[PDB]
């Protein structure tokens, strides 16, 4: 299913003026906007070609929202420092991720809103979009403030309305790229590590979206405990790369098979070292 | 999530500056809204107070007349500079815990500002309680007490009924507005009345006390004299009755 996400990072910096606020937006695995408060006149900027179609009023509307967030996160950072009895000399970070998952239809399938403090879960909106899960008692002070302000109700109206409507508009405006799955270009390489053991590397390249399954099989048995899997990485052209490796004793190269699962593939692939 | 204001009532001479506070009592507010209400009861937005930024004034608002300051995350002040009688009105603020596109707003109690050219025209009320008629008791088996507050200026008065030291609301009705004692002038003193209706059995018991309370809002300590009359200070003027057996 298609999704839209906004990622916020608010960081205090005791000896560099006031807190820095950064926002990035994504439609699936494609980034389309950015904002960074670290400028004299900060402005929202396009990051995908299909969003340049939006007029000046769209950019001003976004800028106004992210300027509100800069101010709001400055106070939240100060408040969280008080909950944890932290010194004003230390630098802290609040992160937030929110957004919608679209169904096969144009319906909200799942809504999200999660916050973190110093890299750990802080407060998250539950699946019902009407209640919260707080990580500790500091987060329960935030929860009490958010229940009194009815933040869960505001989010539910956003997630069920504007979030899915704007995601659908973006998917239509960028359909040639956003609604096209690029299947991986696959191949298996061979690398001797010693005289009687060689590594077999299964490659998946130029694929979009990032979601992929790469598995090695010794005669058809999941070699999951012995497989080296690298984290999916961006190619830099909006496509992704990944590889799965196995240390194989010299002679049993034809014994091992690589299995590739991706939405761009009509049927899952089965590969082996050739020749 | 209450919002409050101070002062709630102001009577001042022309040319004075009046500062009004708007406070979020149990939440932090980056924004507060200031309104003005006249007898034509619509809420007229005057200005938006912004934390760490200058106020946003609405179309038709004399900026230099109404100074708005966002003092902190809980306080905003409105200053009416060189007030004149035409500035007399009900000033009310609102604030909410959500920033950005406005959400739930909580209003303060409002401030009634009365600007007078001459403070010589200020008078407290005289209050009287009128005992229920025998004819009413005989005919209905109910007993209506009537309270009357007369000769007060300006329209700054609040009336309540106290039975046996406790305030009552059941069987009570006060005139929605006072009446001009002389409906053909700018300055005309006012009169207001109220009614408390109890059963004949309740009025008959002499162990029962009935008090009509009139809280008057007048001048303050700093306001000084040149005349001979008693100081028209903010005060309570009461009148009472007792149970009557026959």
């Amino acid at each position: 299913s298609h999704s839209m996400r906004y990622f916020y990072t608010a960081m205090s910096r005791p000896g560099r003026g006031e807190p820095r606020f950064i926002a990035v937006g994504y439609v699936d695995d494609t980034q389309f906007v950015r904002f960074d408060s670290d400028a004299a006149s900060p402005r929202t900027e396009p990051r995908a070609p299909w969003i340049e179609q939006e007029g000046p009023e769209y950019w001003d509307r976004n800028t106004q929202i992210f300027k509100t967030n800069t101010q709001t996160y400055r106070e939240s950072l100060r408040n969280l420092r008080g909950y944890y009895n932290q010194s004003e000399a230390g630098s802290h970070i609040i992160q937030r991720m929110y957004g919608c998952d679209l169904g096969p239809d144009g319906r909200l399938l799942r809504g999200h809103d999660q916050s973190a403090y110093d890299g750990k879960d802080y407060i998250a909106l539950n699946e019902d979009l009407s209640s919260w899960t707080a990580a500790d008692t500091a987060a329960q002070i935030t929860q009490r403030k958010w229940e009194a302000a009815r933040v869960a109700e505001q989010l539910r109206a956003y997630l069920e309305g504007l979030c899915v409507e704007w995601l659908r508009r973006y998917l239509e405006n960028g359909k040639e790229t956003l609604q096209r799955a690029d299947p991986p270009k696959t191949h298996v390489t061979h690398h001797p590590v010693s005289d009687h053991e060689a590594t077999l590397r299964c490659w998946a390249l130029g694929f979009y979206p990032a979601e992929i399954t790469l598995t090695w099989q010794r005669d058809g048995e999941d070699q999951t405990q012995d497989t080296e899997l690298v984290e999916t990485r961006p190619a830099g052209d909006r496509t992704f790369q990944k590889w799965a490796a196995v240390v194989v004793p010299s002679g049993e190269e034809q014994r091992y098979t690589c299995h590739v699962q991706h939405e761009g593939l009509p049927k899952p692939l089965t590969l082996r070292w050739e020749p | 999530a209450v919002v409050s204001q101070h002062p709630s009532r102001v009577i001042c001479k022309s040319g004075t500056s009046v500062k009004i506070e708007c406070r979020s009592l149990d939440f932090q507010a980056t924004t507060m809204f200031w309104y003005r209400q006249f007898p034509k009861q619509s809420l007229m937005l005057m200005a938006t107070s912004n934390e760490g930024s200058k106020a946003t004034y609405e179309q038709g608002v004399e900026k230099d007349k109404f100074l708005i300051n966002h003092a902190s995350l809980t306080l905003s002040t409105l200053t009416v500079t060189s007030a004149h009688p035409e500035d007399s009105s009900f000033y009310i603020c609102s604030a909410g815990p959500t920033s950005g596109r406005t959400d739930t707003q909580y209003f303060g109690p409002g401030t009634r500002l009365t600007v007078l050219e001459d403070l010589k025209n200020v008078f407290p009320p005289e209050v009287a309680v009128f005992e229920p008629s025998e004819a009413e008791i005989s005919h209905t088996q109910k007993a209506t007490l009537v309270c009357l507050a007369t000769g007060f200026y300006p329209d700054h008065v609040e009336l309540s009924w106290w039975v046996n030291g406790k305030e009552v609301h059941s069987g009570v009705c006060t005139d929605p507005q006072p009446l001009k004692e002389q409906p053909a002038l700018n300055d005309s003193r006012y009169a207001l009345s109220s009614r408390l209706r109890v059963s004949a059995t309740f009025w008959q018991n002499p162990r029962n006390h009935f008090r009509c309370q009139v809280q008057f809002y007048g001048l303050s300590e700093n306001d000084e004299w040149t005349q001979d009359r008693a100081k028209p200070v903010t005060q309570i003027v009461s009148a009472e009755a007792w149970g009557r057996a026959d």
Binding site: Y6, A23, G25, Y58, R61, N62, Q64, I65, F66, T68, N69, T72, E75, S76, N79, L80, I94, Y98, S115, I123, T142, K145, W146, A149, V151, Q154, L155, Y158, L162, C163, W166 | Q28, T30, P97, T98, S99, G100, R101, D103
Partner: peptide
């Protein structure tokens, strides 16, 4: 389009 209401933590 991002969410335009923000509430201090």
């Amino acid at each position: 389009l991002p969410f335009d209401k923000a509430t201090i933590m």
